[PDB]
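Re: adenosine-5'-diphosphate structure - here you go.
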Amino acid sequence: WXAXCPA
Amino acid sequence: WXAXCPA
Amino acid sequence: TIRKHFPQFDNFSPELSTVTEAAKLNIEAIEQECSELIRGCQNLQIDCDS
Amino acid sequence: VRLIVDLGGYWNQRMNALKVKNIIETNYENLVRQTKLIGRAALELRDSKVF
Amino acid sequence: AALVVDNGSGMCKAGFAGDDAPRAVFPSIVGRPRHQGVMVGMGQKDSYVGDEAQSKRGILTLKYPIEHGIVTNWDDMEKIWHHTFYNELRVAPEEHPVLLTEAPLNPKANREKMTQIMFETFNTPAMYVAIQAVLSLYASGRTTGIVMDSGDGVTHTVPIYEGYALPHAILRLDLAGRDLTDYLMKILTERGYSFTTTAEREIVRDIKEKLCYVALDFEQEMATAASSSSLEKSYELPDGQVITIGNERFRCPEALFQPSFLGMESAGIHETTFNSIMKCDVDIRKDLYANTVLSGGTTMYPGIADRMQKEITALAPSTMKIKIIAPPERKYSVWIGGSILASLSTFQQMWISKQEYDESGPSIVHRKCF
Amino acid sequence: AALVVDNGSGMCKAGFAGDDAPRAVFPSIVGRPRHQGVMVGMGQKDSYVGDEAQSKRGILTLKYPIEHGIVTNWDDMEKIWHHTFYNELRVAPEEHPVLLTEAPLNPKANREKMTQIMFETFNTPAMYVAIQAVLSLYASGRTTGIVMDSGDGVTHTVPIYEGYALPHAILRLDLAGRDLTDYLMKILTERGYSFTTTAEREIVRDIKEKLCYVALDFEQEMATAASSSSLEKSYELPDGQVITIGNERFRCPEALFQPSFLGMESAGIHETTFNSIMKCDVDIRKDLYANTVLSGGTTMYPGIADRMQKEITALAPSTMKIKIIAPPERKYSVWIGGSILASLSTFQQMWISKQEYDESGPSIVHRKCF
Ligand SMILES: Nc1ncnc2c1ncn2[C@@H]1O[C@H](COP(=O)(O)OP(=O)(O)O)[C@@H](O)[C@H]1O
Ligand SMILES: Nc1ncnc2c1ncn2[C@@H]1O[C@H](COP(=O)(O)OP(=O)(O)O)[C@@H](O)[C@H]1O
Ligand SMILES: [Mg+2]
Ligand SMILES: [Mg+2]
């Protein structure tokens, strides 16, 4: 993800 | 709650 | 039938839109509400003057 | 005692005067719009050849 | 002096009678550190309460002891009360009566336990239990009106015509800001931002308080948002990353009036107002229309009153006039009204005595308080 | 064979003339799914009614087409009737006369409205409409009396006499089963159970039908209920949860006798029964007292008969005798009485034919069957 996690 | 919802 | 041989009557909703708004309005209460104002103000005139 | 008992002779009439003035200051303008709306609709339907 | 404490689902305040502003302002959360202590230099307390937790909220398991206005965890609840009286308010409870506020339509077990705690843990000289929403109307200087309270766990509508409210027309809805916080995040995942833990939930809480707003026309606004730009705003995360949000600015606050997006069959907040006023008498209906009052931190959204006034206007017949009152400081109306009520001399006789509690146990609260 | 169809606010009853029990007894509900369907190829219907709607009620938004007696939706009302004939009864209406019932003091607007939708959509060969209250005592085997008609939508008190209704003496009271079910939930939350949605509105309807009962003395029973746990009973929720109610068994049904508990200025049926009989003639008043009858599913509560007998006795003069007739089959009394009326040989006289309607039009019903 863009904000939060890596994805 | 007890019977219903989470409370 | 209308949308086949009567193009002039294709959609009468847009041409008559004030009737829809007036349907939500209750006529009898409107006269009752306003006519009370004439009653109250006329009672004020005698109350203030006499 | 200084307001209700003291002025009970004309208190209600003074209150009767104030309530109407505030009422007129508020409802009068929208009443005119409501009347102008209903009369216009009646004229519109009477003057509609499509209907 | 008499102390005023207003326990809320997420936000709890406390102060003194006659004051115009609550003394203590800190959220009501207790967290426990999941990780294991490595360093022994500092205290590293077992638990932290209030503003202490949020400062270190990254490493705590934040828990809300009260849910939907119901204290689920009583063990944690006394930790707040102990913290309020000794750390924030730094006063001894056994010299002053204290008043607590509750939502209407609560379980009888909720408000019997607090009275037991007050007269056994803190040994307060006196106590009182007063509905949250009714005190809000006192802050507006009115006694004939309907109060729209909307906090974090409860969204209750109550009409009040005289010094006491009508219990029969009280409509309580469990749709509030905390449900809204759960709602933007699932929608926010559409834009590529993932927030799951409770620590980032307060970060989620912040963006709602600053960027969310009520749209007057949801259908027209979403069409406007389809053209892109002119609505997206940039917000900086505590990490440092800057996020941009489009249509979601109005979509989440819109869910109040269309609960179909959240999956519960109850009608919108605009509609339940109409239902409650239908349950009262015809003559009292005229007064309540012109005396509609909003309260609670949820009602802070810009333009919420304007859209609310439009919605009720369509449902209500055009004869009666609708005026929505939105005082600027309606955030603390519940506490402020309590300060006025506590300051009243007539209220010295509606206090509950410690001796009276002893004779009747904790069951006296049903009969005396309301 | 003449069909006898009993449209009701809660339950819909249908069968055949001469039968001792309705053939199909299914709820009068209409359901429309609130969620989109993702599993294709099933042929899922658009609208669901009756038992099938009740079976899948969790994912449906149930609506009552009839509320407070007046039909608020004429489009759904035919659908349940359409399901009534072809699905539940599996009989073609083209070759059978059908019997429907009408409510006391019904507005004239509806009466041709059912007429104009039956002779056209289903083209039934013959028709007749009578009062459900009149058919109540017909099943009881008497022709003169007063009926304590209570149901899901409305309640009426009709002092019938030789089977001819008295319009001026008809009293309408808004204390129906739906009100009690709505009152049961607002008082059930005191024990921590929160039922709000419409799907679970049937659940409390199931609970009160099995557990609620009428207490002879309210003041004595609350004292005993508080003192001992004997009155408490355990009920099982469909999810497996176990609930217990202590005093709500006798409290919800008591509102039928104390409407101020709901906040209605109109008083209970016990005085309304006495109020109605005050309007009749003095000479006939002797007969009406001794042939009072109870009807409808609302009057199913245990111990309801002796309680009303005790109360109206104090209201009634000491000289008069009161005989409360409560047949155990009074649940289907309205349906059974219609089957009795249809089976009569002389009942062919006041048929309204399809041909005669054509020249007479919708207005014939007001004068033919009155
Ligand atoms: N500026 C704001 N805009 C939108 N919502 C806000 C704002 N400030 C506070 N809130 C909401 O109000 C809620 C708390 O309001 P309040 O009723 O004062 O406390 P509680 O709900 O705990 O009683 C918070 O959960 C927050 O989401
Ligand atoms: N054993 C029972 N105890 C309590 N209430 C009952 C019982 N059986 C049925 N009822 C109630 O009676 C209602 C049935 O109403 P009904 O008589 O069918 O209305 P109508 O007379 O309009 O057809 C249901 O809503 C149900 O709540
Ligand atoms: Mg609050
Ligand atoms: Mg009935």
